[PDB]
């Protein structure tokens, strides 16, 4: 068969709402694994300066203490069934994931129902996990692209709830007690901001009967009718530059505010971002690589790596490029990156956009190949897009994108805009912000 018939033959996600409003979705396929996870809409957003590390602390803390199965009885039960867990926490999503066999499904959803509602919070575990969180946050300074992405989120959205980290600062970790964490659990872990993603190996009527038995009546009504509210965060085009000249490699990111999740143009900004592409120095393509920024970078030995990202949040996104470069070619990488960006934005070709559309189609089906990242897509799509967009509709959104369409909405979201610039390392040969802005908008057009 063909591509459109094959992505039609990819099975649908039945999404259903329980008696409290919690959303349940599954993707039944042929494999015998089973990847049930709860996605909660809490994150670093919907946190103030107080209780800032509460989402990362509860992500760390939901496995260690339980009301019904106390101590390490969660670990003993999940290794009696032999399963694997995961807990990633982002700026707008926190999640709990179990990959298992499909014959352990009431044990998996019972362990999730004891994780997300009946988690106990012992103060000895609070002190021990506070020490482990402080040691991990000291270890996280080596994670330099995470440092630069956190600096970019600090300098891109200053004065907003998106300025703060997911982990929280060290002056805010040390004052987090139990009652602030259970206030965060009573506020932001509410049931219709929670989805139950399954992927293959399951049956949806079995999952809805088990969600009626276990994950029903979590919490629906607020305490004093005090609803949380999302705000449109201000994007401030700024520059932060952490200068460490003894450090070997400079990580510099440049990002413009993109439209975000609910706006329909993430496909065309992603196909511009995928025309620009990515490079690391272990890639054996050489000079003959298709992306001309990577071809120029390996032609004149500019940088070690560059990665072009479209990180999206609800109405606010960061789309840009982060490069690991040396101390002597940041001006070259910034000039050739803005030249490739606005060569794309002025002179986009049909061969370039069909290369990008093909690499986006392959990147989306390679992302949604595996059961754990397709559950990541099910949870993120159910919390953000409302419905879950199937890949036939993603193909129909991809196939309408042409070079003219890309040129004007690139002129909307790229041209003459003030970007946010972050840098950790030897940031001396970064240009100053007026040279970044003069290297944005073109001398010809």
């Amino acid at each position: 068969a063909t591509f459109a018939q094959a992505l039609q033959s990819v099975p649908e996600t039945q999404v259903s709402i329980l008696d409290n409003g919690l959303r349940v979705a599954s993707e039944q396929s042929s494999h015998a694994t089973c990847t049930v996870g709860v996605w909660i809409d809490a994150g670093s957003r919907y946190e103030t300066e107080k209780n800032n590390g509460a989402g990362y602390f509860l992500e760390h803390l939901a496995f260690k203490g339980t009301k019904n199965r106390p101590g390490n009885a969660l670990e003993k039960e999940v290794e009696s069934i032999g399963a694997h867990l995961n807990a990633y926490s982002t700026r707008e999503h926190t999640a709990y994931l179990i990959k298992a066999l499909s014959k352990d499904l009431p044990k998996v959803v019972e362990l999730l129902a004891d994780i997300v509602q009946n988690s106990s919070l012992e103060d000895s575990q609070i002190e021990k996990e506070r020490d482990v969180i402080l040691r991990e946050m000291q270890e996280n300074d080596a994670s330099m692209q995470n440092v630069v992405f956190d600096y970019l989120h600090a300098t891109a959205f200053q004065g907003t709830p998106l300025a703060q980290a997911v982990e929280g600062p060290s002056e805010n970790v040390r004052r987090l007690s139990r009652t602030d964490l259970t206030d965060y659990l009573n506020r932001h872990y509410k049931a219709p901001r929670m989805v139950l993603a399954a992927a293959g190996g399951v049956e949806h009527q079995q999952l809805l009967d088990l969600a009626q038995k276990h994950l029903s009546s979590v919490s629906r009504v607020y305490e004093e009718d005090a609803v949380p509210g999302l705000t449109p965060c201000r994007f401030t085009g700024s520059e932060i530059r952490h200068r460490d000249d003894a450090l070997p490699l400079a990580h510099v990111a440049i990002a413009v505010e993109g439209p975000g999740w609910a706006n329909p143009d993430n496909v065309t900004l992603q196909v511009a971002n995928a025309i620009i592409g990515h490079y690391d120095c272990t890639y054996g393509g050489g000079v003959h690589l298709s992306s001309p920024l990577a071809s120029v970078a390996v032609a004149n030995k500019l940088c070690q790596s560059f990665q072009t990202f479209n990180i999206s949040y609800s109405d606010t996104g960061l789309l840009g490029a982060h490069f690991v470069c040396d101390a002597m070619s940041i001006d070259d990488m910034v000039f050739f990156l803005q030249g490739q960006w606005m060569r794309l934005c002025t002179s986009a070709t049909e061969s370039e956009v069909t290369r990008g559309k093909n690499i986006l189609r392959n990147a989306l089906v390679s992302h949604l190949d595996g059961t754990t990242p397709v559950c990541e897509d099910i949870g993120r799509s159910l919390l953000t897009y409302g419905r879950r967009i199937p890949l036939a509709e993603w193909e129909s959104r991809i196939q309408e994108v042409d070079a003219q369409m890309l040129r004007d909405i690139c002129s909307k979201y790229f041209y003459d805009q003030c970007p946010a610039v972050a840098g950790y390392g030897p940031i001396e040969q970064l240009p100053d912000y007026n040279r970044i802005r003069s290297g944005m908008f073109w001398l010809r057009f």
Binding site: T346, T349, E350, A403, R444
Partner: protein, 51 residues
Amino acid sequence: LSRFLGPRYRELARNWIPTAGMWGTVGAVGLVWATDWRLILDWVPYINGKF
């Protein structure tokens, strides 16, 4: 020339038609404004009278 003639370069030239034509009108209007041509400045109604 032979490497510069193609479908992609014709599409890039079609993409660069209106801004280069507008830059040509920028150069023509600037040449008219610099030299003050008596045939052309007598058609504009704001400089219609004697200047």
